Amino acid sequence: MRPLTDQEMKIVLDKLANYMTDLKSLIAPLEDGDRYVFRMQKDRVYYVKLSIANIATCVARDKLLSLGTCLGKMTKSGKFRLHITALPILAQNARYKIWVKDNGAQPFLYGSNIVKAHVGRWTEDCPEHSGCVVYNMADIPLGFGVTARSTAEARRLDPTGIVCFRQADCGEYLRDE
């Protein structure tokens, strides 16, 4: 386990800036004085407390499996991909928000992209390819993805048209059981 370098943290924070607003809130000292840091273990980024990460040093490298909340993995080509295990962090400070109905939440959890007839609420003034976080009508976070068109463009859409490409949904927890 090692912390990120200059190149790795630029890539990680670039992916987080696509989906969130208050990125300085994440790197901010709390009441006790400790901070939240980033750790890398086996090509995987963990968003964990510094006090937790300091007392996890005594675990051997091969013998350590997880730490706090896993954001995602860095691939072989160097890109950083976000996972659904980062969704509570994304939902806390989501920039653009889309709400789906009960007839659209179940297709999303199976792995489908959001269709126009599934949407129950939009966020005004959303650009074309922006990072949105998907909720249901009960304000339960379901996943995140990228919008297909702008909000003004998607209001005129035929209701079988795609309004948000799916990237992660919380049915991935059923995959690893």
């Binding site: 990120l4 370098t5 630029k10 800036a17 300085k24 901070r35």
Partner: protein, 88 residues
């Protein structure tokens, strides 16, 4: 269309300097950005790049002064760390 990383292209000295070039196929020594001040200065450029064009001249200046102040505070911490390393 192919990537410059795969081709063995030498680095060229421009107005942007080349700096000290690490040899190919050897240890590119990792420098860590665990420090919060070093985390803030990287965060300032990420937020500035995503925001883009601002019509206001004053708000465009404040977007740059935030990056400048982040660089100054990080440099003061690194100089104090260098002084502590020189003492040790």
């Amino acid at each position: 269309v192919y990537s410059e990383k795969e081709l063995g292209i030498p680095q060229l000295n421009t107005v942007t300097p080349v700096g000290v070039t690490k040899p190919k196929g050897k240890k590119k020594g990792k420098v860590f950005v665990d420090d919060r001040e070093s985390m803030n200065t990287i965060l300032a450029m990420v937020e500035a790049e995503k925001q883009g064009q601002i019509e206001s001249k004053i708000m465009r200046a404040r977007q740059l002064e935030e990056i400048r102040e982040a660089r100054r505070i990080e440099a003061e911490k690194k100089e104090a760390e260098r002084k502590a390393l020189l003492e040790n």
